[PDB]
Symmetry: T
Subunit: 67 residues, 12 copies
């Protein structure tokens, strides 16, 4: 009876992996409703002069569809 | 020339796998047009006192984009 | 000593997943002998006005080779 | 804080896929407690004179560990 | 800080693989903004009397989300 | 009701990827009937003094079985 | 001569990924002996009003079997 | 210009893995011509009272198609 | 009706791959009953001064559950 | 007796997929000797105002090691 | 025109996942030039008396090749 | 603190799988130092008039990086 949708996002952060995930979820909840779960598909990033420049976490976000 | 889009849905049902797929497709067709095919990516579910509580079928739905 | 062969078939049905599998196996046994096991590789289908038009079960069929 | 364990089972049935899953879950709940979810990893089976002899559903069962 | 979204499209063409990709991207840029990268997930197609009828390139398109 | 079979071929060409696919399909249609679709599984090749010697496209070809 | 066993656990934590792993390992060492290594299979989680509710790390734990 | 075909076989042997592969290739060369390469997809087997009863090597065999 | 369980083991040996598998199965049969089949998931090992120090075969062992 | 090494390269081109592969192989042969084969692992690219800006082909290059 | 190379490293740390990545990148930049991006392939580790002994992050590092 | 590197090799032998692995490791230790572990990625080979001509084992070799 219930139907969910999954959207694929890429959260980024200079701080770490959790912050990268949280950035994705923060943006997701502005536009999507009934956010339930997430699944990390991929962890990558960019490299700068001091090592990791940007952590990039490719993420699926699952949420309940209405009506 | 033709371009399609794929959306990832999770259909659920207490009855079985086909009903779970049909629940996803029924909801899809309310909002999406030119639904053509589907691809089952994953079959999971929740467990209750009497065994399977809910069947959950993770599904990609392909449809033609307009214009 | 024994050698088996695997053939990849796609069974279809408007009724459900088991019927799709059975359609593949019914056709397989007309031409192939010593059918032993099957492995479902993929579940997909077509969509019509009333939801699932056709279930399509991609299937490997394993059978013993003679001689 | 919570920790879960996953066990891999193979449920079988001459009837169909749901019944195969249910057979696994029925046996699981005799010995395991706090059964929460399952994930189907694989669908296979044996072939007889009348097509499918036995459906075999390879399944992961997730449950909460105590203390 | 930056968040991207990925959408899955299927571009088609009778001419070849690059044209199939380009058809997807051309349609994508009508509706989506800040298109950055793509990832080919799958190459398939239909067969006609003269060989390949239609090339079909399943593609993920990544773009920056605003705000 | 309808049952398809999939055969795995490797098409080769010194020209490019599309030609390699077309070589596989051209040979397929001499012996197989009711060719419907293809799925590229793998792209590889051999290297010579001037770069790519031979493109090799590993391909599944799907066709309807008769009777 | 030596034989190891692998058990699949899911560690959870509201804090982060390392804490989720550590929760799994802490529970593991209460019951299992000769714990040697782990392999992360999957990172997922639940979503709440403030973003990540629970981080869930699916983990294989390898340990030496006795006698 | 050249087109190859791949057939999937399962070689078995009570001796070991190489013998299992050789059993498959021996049977293959009775019926197939221009055998070129093989790819091991899977290694499994049956268990008896003295350990391994039968080694089973699932194998793809590639060969050149004529004309 | 019948339900099986799968356990994941790592057999090791300085001799070779078969011996590594047999070591796993020998230990398995001391504690587990109704051992039926195995599936090799992974082959790895350690390196010493004379090449392979230890072969390590990651293996799933399937057995029938009682009552 | 023979040992090969595989190196992973990313060839790029504004023209197409073959040219991207050829760019990788051209650079490879300046530094590496006894180049034998390649395997395409991934096809991606960047997007510009006119569609595909750059095709990027992630490629494994296999070559014979000396002495 | 541009060609990149990918090298596979395993960074380790007793502190956490980010530190493990950073250790790999720190060592990489001593010897490699034009480091651009990384891709995490695998997360594993060793277990000690107090849980995680060492986090081990298997990582691909991509960098631009010169001239 | 410690960083490892992984190199991908293909060992070959007319004798068997272990010998193929050993050939790769023998060549590796001439040029690489602090060789620790290996992971078999793939088993393939060539076919001759008497069955297996050459066994080919695709192998990752992991070793500790210095300074
Ligand atoms: C990549 C992709 C996958 C498809 N898979 C299937 C398949 O699952 N089974 C099927 O019957 N048709 C499949 N089709 C064909 C579509 O279902 C549909 O019949 C065809 O694309 C025509 O769509 P249209 O008339 O809306 O343009 C596939 C098409 C594409 C683009
Ligand atoms: C690689 C392979 C996979 C098999 N998978 C199954 C399985 O799915 N379930 C099962 O009951 N038997 C399985 N079997 C055993 C066969 O179903 C069959 O019982 C056995 O090969 C003996 O049959 P035969 O007398 O025709 O040689 C498998 C055998 C092989 C070779
Ligand atoms: C996960 C992900 C994958 C990316 N893959 C590529 C790549 O395929 N090739 C490339 O040139 N850039 C790649 N990029 C970088 C983007 O193409 C883009 O240049 C960058 O995100 C900055 O764009 P922005 O200003 O729109 O944020 C990737 C970025 C992310 C988030
Ligand atoms: C599992 C499978 C995969 C398919 N994939 C595609 C797809 O790649 N693209 C497409 O246009 N049609 C796809 N089709 C649809 C077929 O190409 C074909 O149009 C349809 O099955 C009707 O075939 P028939 O008229 O010979 O019975 C697929 C069909 C099946 C069975
Ligand atoms: C299949 C398998 C995988 C292993 N993976 C790792 C690895 O991830 N990192 C590591 O440091 N050790 C790894 N080990 C080695 C063990 O952690 C341990 O150091 C070694 O087996 C010695 O254990 P023992 O003294 O109990 O016999 C692995 C061992 C096996 C059998
Ligand atoms: C990612 C990775 C995978 C490993 N896998 C194994 C394993 O397959 N089996 C094993 O015995 N050791 C494994 N190890 C541990 C190494 O073989 C080695 O024993 C350990 O890293 C100590 O090496 P060192 O003294 O040079 O620092 C692994 C180590 C790493 C980093
Ligand atoms: Na972290
Ligand atoms: Na069903
Ligand atoms: Na092309
Ligand atoms: Na062997």
């Amino acid at each position: 009876g219930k139907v969910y949708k999954k959207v694929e996002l890429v959260g980024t952060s200079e701080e770490g992996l959790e912050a990268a995930i949280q950035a994705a979820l923060a943006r997701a909840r502005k536009t999507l409703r009934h956010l339930d779960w997430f699944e990390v598909k991929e962890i990558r990033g960019t490299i700068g002069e001091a090592g990791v420049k940007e952590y990039q976490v490719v993420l699926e976000v699952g949420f309940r569809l209405e009506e």
